[PDB]
Structure 1
Amino acid sequence: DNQFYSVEVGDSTFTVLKRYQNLKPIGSGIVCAAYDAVLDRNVAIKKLSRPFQNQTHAKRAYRELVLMKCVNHKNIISLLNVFTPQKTLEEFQDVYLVMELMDANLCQVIQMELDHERMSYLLYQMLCGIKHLHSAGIIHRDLKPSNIVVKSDCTLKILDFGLAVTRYYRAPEVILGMGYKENVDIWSVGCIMGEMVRHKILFPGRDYIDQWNKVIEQLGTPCPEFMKKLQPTVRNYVENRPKYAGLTFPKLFPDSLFPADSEHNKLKASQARDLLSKMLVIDPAKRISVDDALQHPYINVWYDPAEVEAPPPQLDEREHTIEEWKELIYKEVMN
């Protein structure tokens, strides 16, 4: 009459409530798909294994659990259930997060040919979500395809809340650590959009060094005044990098790559390029804001004041010993 049972999912041991049935490996913390017999709907279940095991695993977990439990928007994850099989703070090991299941992760979507209604819709949804987080002072700073999911009917959700390991989608200000505002997530959005057109990661980099080489090798060296905002040592590295005027957007995202047989298709293809050309701007002082990107004629066909302007959702990251976490996380799981 103990409510839990154990199975192997892919590899690891899942100990979940009896309600979740027919667990299937979909991800690897270690995520899987299940039928929730109570709700009668499909679900994704995520195993967090000893999440108090270090400051990295811990902060991420505590942040993402407080955060998950007060953000309420159709384009960010709606947590359906949190539970631990362990009975006592003494025996506590794992946390299981549960949300409803989508048909695709955004990496599979990037790999196909999107028409503009769809591509435009995803990017719209990404912005609505991003717009929600920003209104609770949450600046994500690490949007990536693997943490976005999608329904067959084209509805999109963002799974995570970002930086306090895929670095391709991180903004210039992140890569060189310089201080950001909300549109830092506009870089990342545009890197996703860019990849939807190109079906190639825009900036495939070994490290922050290799990545930066790849940004400028295409968009060009940032102008004088951007550099004048970098900390003396980083500014000095950046300044003695080989210069580049870099390709223009028609050259970066040619006509070859676009649906362009209908006149609609032709008209929209140039609207995407325009929008991309505004998102993928290195200097954040020159890069489009989340409110402008929604007034762009590519996106704005979807504009919905209910979606775009939703009511906004203690102060987080702080130092704790890997025992004080065990308890902090455990209290959050028991509510």
Structure 2
Amino acid sequence: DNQFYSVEVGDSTFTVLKRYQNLKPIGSGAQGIVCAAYDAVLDRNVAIKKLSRPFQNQTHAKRAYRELVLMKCVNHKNIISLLNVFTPQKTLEEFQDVYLVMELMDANLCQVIQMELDHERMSYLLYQMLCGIKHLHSAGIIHRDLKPSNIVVKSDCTLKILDFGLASFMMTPYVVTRYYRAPEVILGMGYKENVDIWSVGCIMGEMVRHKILFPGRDYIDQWNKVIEQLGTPCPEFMKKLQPTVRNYVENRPKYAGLTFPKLFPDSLFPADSEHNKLKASQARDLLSKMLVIDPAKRISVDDALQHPYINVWYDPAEVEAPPPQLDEREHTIEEWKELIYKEVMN
């Protein structure tokens, strides 16, 4: 008679509704554990993420409350949608965990980057990323923390973006990934819409190079790998920095920056036919417009969707979407509990 049952997937206890059967682990981020299962009601396979007590601290509660509201507020083919929310607990006092159900995908973008892709599939994945990004901007949402681990794909090359970005001490052993954050985020300078274009550039470069473009233990090593490859930024970008961080960055050794045919040689691109030779140059051209330190010179999302390497998928009903207030604050763990609990009850 109990409409719930408990399964032990790895070390986490998955207490889900009886409609979800055959639970199997598929992924693991930092906010919860994800499982695949068969939804006996909808007759389809779903992905279930379990958020263990998200009100336990401010970082977990701010992120959980954020993505819980936006996923019923924003819809798109390239932005993941909510299928069902539930908690096995009955009252606010007993409230513990939140389970998010979404349509099951086939792989992470990290698994796809490890593969060798043609120009058709690379351009299509990059087209779907810019479509969902522009819908986020159309809804007044800027990500600033795009990364392959939060992007899922299917075998038919369909792409969807999992999370909604940044708004922070972490009491956890798992470290966050910062290799894809724009220089303005690395140095704290303020941003516009095109801050996510940089993250697209690091991903697109990684699909070609099969190596993290700007690795490092901290922002100290990361900014080094940026200027050692793209070059020391121009003084107009310099003066836009805060005086403290402007001094440190200006005091670094000056680099001319390697050219883009050198950062991405032709041997890394499908270059056997004439059509493949042209697409390799168009791809490298999009890398040149996206991977630039200065945001004022950086290409925008709308201009990237019209780039020759991308606009082969251009379709008006697919690019844009309707545009659908502001709940940013600081609460206690008890206040955060009720705020998240009522969002689950809806």
TM-score category by the smaller chain? Answer: over 0.9
Structure 2 residue aligned with 1:296 = 307
SS at match of 1:56: helix
Q: Is the 8 A contact 1:133 1:139 kept in 2?
A: yes
Tell me, in whole angstroms, the C-alpha distance in 2 between the residues paired with 1:116 and 1:317.
41
Tell me, in whole angstroms, the C-alpha distance in 1 between the residues paired with 2:43 and 2:9.
21
Q: Is the 8 A contact 1:220 1:244 kept in 2?
A: yes
1:23-63 deviation per Cα after TM superposition (whole angstroms, max 9, x unaligned): 00112211111111111111110000000000000000000
1:175-199 deviation per Cα after TM superposition (whole angstroms, max 9, x unaligned): 0011000000000001100000000
Tell me, in whole angstroms, the C-alpha distance in 1 between the residues paired with 2:324 and 2:216.
35
Tell me, in whole angstroms, the C-alpha distance in 1 between the residues paired with 2:161 and 2:230.
28
Question: How far apart are 1:109 and its partner, in Å?
Answer: 0.3
Q: Is the 8 A contact 1:10 1:24 kept in 2?
A: no
**237-246 or 304-313, larger mean C-alpha shift:** 304-313
Question: How far apart are 1:149 and its partner, in Å?
Answer: 0.3
Tell me, in whole angstroms, the C-alpha distance in 2 between the residues paired with 1:279 and 1:306.
25
Tell me, in whole angstroms, the C-alpha distance in 1 between the residues paired with 2:275 and 2:107.
27
SS at match of 2:54: coil
| TM-score, structure 2 as length reference | 0.96
Structure 1 residue aligned with 2:13 = 13
1:31-46 correspondence to structure 2 within 5 Å = 31-46=34-49
How many aligned residue pairs are there? Answer: 335
Tell me, in whole angstroms, the C-alpha distance in 2 between the residues paired with 1:106 and 1:56.
25
1:153-182 deviation per Cα after TM superposition (whole angstroms, max 9, x unaligned): 000000000112000000000000110000
From 129, 134, 147, the equivalent of 2:137 is 134
SS at match of 2:267: coil
Q: Is the 8 A contact 1:182 1:289 kept in 2?
A: yes
Question: How far apart are 1:10 and its partner, in Å?
Answer: 1.8
Long gaps (5+) in structure 1: none
| Identical counterparts, % of pairs | 100
Question: How far apart are 1:316 and its partner, in Å?
Answer: 2.3
Question: How far apart are 1:313 and its partner, in Å?
Answer: 2.4
RMSD across aligned C-alpha pairs, in angstroms? 0.6
Tell me, in whole angstroms, the C-alpha distance in 2 between the residues paired with 1:17 and 1:49.
16
Q: Is the 8 A contact 1:19 1:38 kept in 2?
A: yes
1:82 partnered with 2:85: yes
Question: How far apart are 1:106 and its partner, in Å?
Answer: 0.4
Off by >3 Å, runs of 4+ in structure 1: none
1:220-267 deviation per Cα after TM superposition (whole angstroms, max 9, x unaligned): 000110011000001011100111001010010001101000111111
SS at match of 1:52: helix
Question: How far apart are 1:130 and its partner, in Å?
Answer: 0.3
Long gaps (5+) in structure 2: 168-175
Question: How far apart are 1:205 and its partner, in Å?
Answer: 1.2
SS at match of 2:229: helix
